[PDB]
Structures are given as C-alpha cells and as structure tokens.
C-alpha cells in the first residue's frame, strides 16, 4: 500500500537542511507564533489597562523592561480567545485585554509538546535511544507548573509570570515575600540540581580537556580528533587516578558518568516543579511553628529565620498596592512597617 | 542487566557512537549547530559555566 | 551580636536552631575589618559574643 | 513446578554508598520540617 | 522548643526503612558467587 498517507510520510521525512517530520506540523506554527507574539507584544503592546504599566519599545521600555504582561485579574482564568466573549473578535481590544499572554502561553505549551515529539520522531528514524526526549520532560514540567498550574490554583492568570526580563525578576521577589519560597525544600532540591549540573558540566569538560592523549603534533589539540576513530580521545585511567587522589572518589564507569549528568539537573527541575504545584494552593513552607512559639513568648530570641520574615513583611506591604492595582490597597504611611530611620 | 556493565574501566575503545549522536542532534536543530569533535564539545562544556560563574563572582 | 548593637542573634542548634535556620554568625559590626584572633579577646566568652569563630573559619 | 521467570537481583557496593548518601542527605534536609 | 514529637519517629523510619532495604540487597549480592 503506497497511498497518499505514505507519500506524505515520504515528503515529511526527507533529509533536508531543516528536518520537518509529522511532529513539525505541530511544532513549527506553534513555536513560530509563540515567538512572534512575544516579539510583537514587547515591541508594540501596552499593559496600561491590565497592570497600569508601560511595557513595549513603542512606549519607551528597553530590553530589560519590556514584557507581554498577564491579563487583568478580572479576566479570571479565561482562555481569552480572540473570538471569545471578552474581545468579541476585536484584535485591538484583545491586545489591550491581555489576549497575547494566553496566546503565547498556549501556543508555547503546544510547541513544547511538538519539540518533544520531534525528539522522539528523529530518534526513531536515526536509531538512537530516546533519552534526549526523556530529559526534555524536565523543562516541560517547569513550564507547565509555573505558567499553567500555578495561576490556575490562584485567582487568575494575572498572578502567572509575565513574559519579560524585569517582569520575571518581580516574580522572583513576589515569591520570596509572599511564599517564602527560598525556605521550600522542593526549591532547595531544584537549586542543588541546577548548581550540581553546572558543576558536573564544568568538571567533566575540564577533566576531558586535561587528560587528552597526544594524538597530533600541533599545540592546538582540537585537530587531533576524528569522529570515526575507535579510541577514546582522553585517558579515563589517568582521570580516575587524579580525582581519586584529589577528592577521594572518582568515576570509573563512563556510562554511569554520563547517565548521572542526565539524572542530576533533570531530577532537580522536577523537584522544583512539585513545590510550585504546592504554591498554586498557597501550600507553602512559610514558617517553623516551633520558632514562632518561642519568639512570640521570648522577645530576646532571634534567628536568621525571624530576620527573613521581617523582610518578607516589608516586601508585601511596600509592593502590594502597585503590584496588585485591582485590589485598591490604600496603606497610609503610618501603617507601613519600617525600621528606625529608614 | 544494567547497560553500565557494557563499559569496562580502562578499555581502549569508545563506548558510544559520536557519529550517531551527531546525526540525531544535527537533525534536531540543523547540522552545523551540532558538534562532531569531542574535544571542542568538551571544551565548550568546560568554558560556558566557568566563564558565566567568573562574571557572577 | 552581628550588627554591633548589643542584639545577639542565635545561630547554633543547642540555642534553638534547626538545620535550616542555623548558622555561624558573622562577627560584630563594631569590629568592622579589624583582625580578631582569639588572643585579642579578654576571654573566650568575649570572643564568642563578638563573633570570633566566623573570622577563624 | 519451578517458575522459569525468576532472576537474581544485585546491588553493588558503589550503589549502596550512593543510596545511603541520598537517604541520609534527604533525612538531613527534611527532618527540620518534620519537627517543624 | 515545641517541636512536633512525631518528627522523631518520622525521621527515624525515613532513614531506617530505605537504608535497610539497600543493605539487604547489597549483602545478598556479596554472598552470591
């Protein structure tokens, strides 16, 4: 049977400069639209009616302060389809209501699905094991938990991260002040995975480059390697002795070593994702009850834990009126928490 | 059995096929975004986090 | 007394800390950048109050 | 009537050390939150 | 300090049950030929 399906399959899987595949039907429009929405919004679109903020190059923002901001809190979790009941097909209103944010987030989610299908598709055609796709589950867990589950647990899309540099920084600080997110053991595991992964990246790369075999005569050692050679280009035996004597332990199995490099950052990102699912519900690691009972009763008891909560209380009181304009917070000067003099 | 027993400490021959990896990863992006020289690939792995952390410091 | 204002901060396990809240606490702001080895203190009790251990570590 | 699907199980010494380290470190991390 | 007192047995079983699992698997691997 060589019908139209098989002929289409032939054309999608041609060896061209940019491979396409069946997955490309999903991947390329969604990725291109998510990127184009972000460039269109950060260049031309305001956040005046949703946030009270300028947020485009047109308005005078720079690369650090442009964003595609989230919709107004009054939109709830509306899909904000262009043809939906809020914008009613009006492209200009849709931009002013925050429709580009759901546009980017949803096309981005489906584009990420498409990229992982592409990793599966190409791996099956070339005949490799699909571990690259498996590792990519970690960026997807992060994107889905932070950009979709988290606002879905909260009151509206407004509290999702906005798509911009400084807007993401605001997201970090909001998470410290309101959620005490540095205290969360699921974030801690995420930190260990990301920093541990950076560590492994550097130490593996440096170790290889400094246990090279002399396989050529030039002082530039890059030329002395051939992709089809059968021999290892560096000495695992010398690498093993160096690290055993420097650090006490060393890798001896090169397959274990490279599985471990996959395992560590991937597991870290997955752990951070679980913690953010908790924060969707305000299920925080905010306090240690034993510390609060002692400190309530003993005004001489002070730890770095109690010092940081005072900082969180400052963040909340000082940023909430501007950061949550729909709430209409009016905090007179006299109620604002402040230390001496400052 | 664990695939890790398929590598033996000190063996002379490489334990994976870099040409297959490059053929997969070159098609994922495009051919010239992929390394086929293990030495320059590993130099890149060393350099990127080290330079970034120098800037952080 | 990290900030030199006679307001001591508890850092150790036996004084009410767990693994997450505990610390060795930086030396006092009254010392600034002055060198504070054990032998510059009138006693160990003084050295501990003023955050001597931080400098030594 | 011996079942043909049985297979021996292994845990090597390095895996024991790695496993014990993971469990001890996880305990050291989570214990503070258990005591709260 | 008024800590949760179940924290002690919770930490102790958290260490002991998976650690014991690993020790059983390891020792019976050594005892094989």
């Amino acid at each position: 049977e060589r019908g139209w399906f098989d002929i289409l399959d032939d054309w999608l899987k041609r060896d061209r400069f940019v491979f396409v595949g069946w997955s490309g039907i999903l991947l390329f429009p969604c990725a291109y639209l998510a990127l184009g929405g972000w460039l269109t919004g950060t260049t031309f679109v305001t956040s005046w009616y949703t946030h009270g903020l300028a947020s485009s190059y047109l308005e005078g923002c720079n690369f650090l302060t442009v964003a595609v901001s989230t919709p107004a809190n009054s939109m709830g979790h509306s899909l904000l389809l262009l043809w939906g009941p809020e914008a009613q097909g009006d492209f200009t209103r849709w931009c002013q209501l925050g429709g580009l944010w759901t546009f980017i987030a949803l096309h981005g989610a489906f584009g990420l699905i498409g990229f992982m299908l592409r990793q599966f598709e190409i791996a099956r055609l070339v005949g490799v094991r699909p571990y690259n796709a498996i590792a990519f589950s970690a960026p997807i867990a992060v994107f889905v938990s932070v950009f979709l589950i988290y606002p879905l647990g909260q009151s509206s899309w407004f509290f999702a991260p906005s798509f911009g540099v400084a807007a993401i920084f605001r997201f970090l600080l909001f998470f410290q002040g309101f959620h005490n997110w540095t205290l969360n053991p699921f974030h801690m595991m995420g930190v260990a995975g990301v920093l541990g992964g950076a560590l492994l990246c550097a130490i593996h790369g440096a170790t290889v480059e400094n246990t090279l075999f002399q396989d050529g005569e030039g002082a530039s050692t890059f030329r002395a390697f051939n992709p089809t050679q059968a021999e290892e280009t560096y000495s695992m035996v010398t690498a093993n002795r160096f690290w055993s004597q420097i650090f006490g332990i060393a890798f001896s199995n090169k397959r274990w070593l490279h599985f471990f490099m996959l395992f560590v950052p991937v597991t870290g990102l997955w752990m951070s994702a679980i913690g953010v699912v908790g924060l969707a519900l305000n299920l925080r690691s905010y306090d240690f009850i034993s510390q609060e009972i002692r400190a309530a009763e003993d005004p001489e008891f002070e730890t770095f834990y109690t010092k940081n909560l005072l900082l969180n209380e400052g963040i909340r009181a000082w940023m909430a009126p501007q950061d949550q304009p729909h709430e209409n917070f009016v905090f007179p000067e006299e109620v604002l928490p402040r230390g001496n003099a400052l | 059995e664990s695939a890790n027993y398929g590598y033996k400490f000190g063996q002379e021959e490489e334990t994976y096929n870099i040409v297959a990896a490059h053929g997969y990863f070159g098609r994922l992006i495009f051919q010239y975004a992929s390394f086929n020289n293990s030495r320059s690939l590993h130099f890149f792995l060393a350099a990127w986090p080290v330079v970034g952390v120098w800037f952080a410091a | 007394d990290i900030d030199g204002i006679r307001e001591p901060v508890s850092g150790s396990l036996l004084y009410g800390n767990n693994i997450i809240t505990g610390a060795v606490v930086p030396s006092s702001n009254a010392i600034g950048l002055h060198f504070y080895p054990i032998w510059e203190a009138a006693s160990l009790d003084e050295w501990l109050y003023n955050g001597g251990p931080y400098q030594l570590i | 009537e011996p079942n043909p699907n049985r297979q021996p199980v292994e845990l090597n010494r390095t895996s024991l050390y790695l496993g014990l380290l993971l469990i001890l470190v996880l305990a050291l991390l989570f214990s503070s939150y258990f005591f709260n | 300090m008024e800590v949760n007192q179940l924290g002690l047995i919770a930490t102790a079983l958290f260490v002991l049950v998976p650690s014991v699992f690993l020790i059983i698997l390891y020792v019976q691997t050594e005892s094989q030929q």
Partner: peptide, 30 residues
Amino acid sequence: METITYVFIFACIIALFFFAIFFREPPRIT
C-alpha cells in the same frame, strides 16, 4: 531530641565518607 537527631544524621554521613573513600570497590583495568 531534635538536636540529637540532626547531629546523629550528620555523623553517619561523615562515617559514610570514610568507607566510601577507604573501603571502595577498587577500580581495576581491563
């Protein structure tokens, strides 16, 4: 109670370091 727990766990880790370094499976070339 809780202080004893924290220090006990810590002490086990330092013991584990000792055996992992000095009583490791020796790497053997082939």
